[PDB]
Design a binder for this molecule. Sequence first.
Ligand SMILES: COC(=O)[C@@H](N)CSC/C=C(\C)CC/C=C(\C)CCC=C(C)C
Length: 149
Amino acid sequence: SAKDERAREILRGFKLNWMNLRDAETGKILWQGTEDLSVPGVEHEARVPKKILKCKAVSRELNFSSTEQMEKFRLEQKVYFKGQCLEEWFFEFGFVIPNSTNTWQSLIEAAPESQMMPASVLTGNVIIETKFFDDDLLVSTSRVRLFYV
Ligand SMILES: COC(=O)[C@@H](N)CSC/C=C(\C)CC/C=C(\C)CCC=C(C)C
């Protein structure tokens, strides 16, 4: 469309290879996926162990490939509970070499146990909406429904 064919070019050349969730304090891998949760237009599912809610902070690794150059690769994540936006996250990777494969690590600090909701209430009710950007270029929007198992 009129909005850059480059955005569509980046998307066709972009692949999310795998993703990790780690205990930020110990480095134990708590959850791993190899499904491209960045694919737009379908509601992905993620089933993560309930024990993750025990962590004070988690480290999320995104390993991605991109045939296309990007000047300022970043993402915006809204966390929804039953359609209510609870959290808005911003993460920047920066410059993406064309044809590169990159591991992207981010630290997610957890809310206190006394302020965070139980797994039984959260599971199936949390939607993460991720917008993938090259600076101001919206490359894709993806939605993942969270289950705590
Ligand atoms: C430690 O307590 C917490 O902070 C709990 N509430 C969550 S830890 C963190 C994150 C997740 C669980 C889900 C992370 C996001 C996923 C799997 C999907 C995002 C999609 C993309 C493509 C980045």
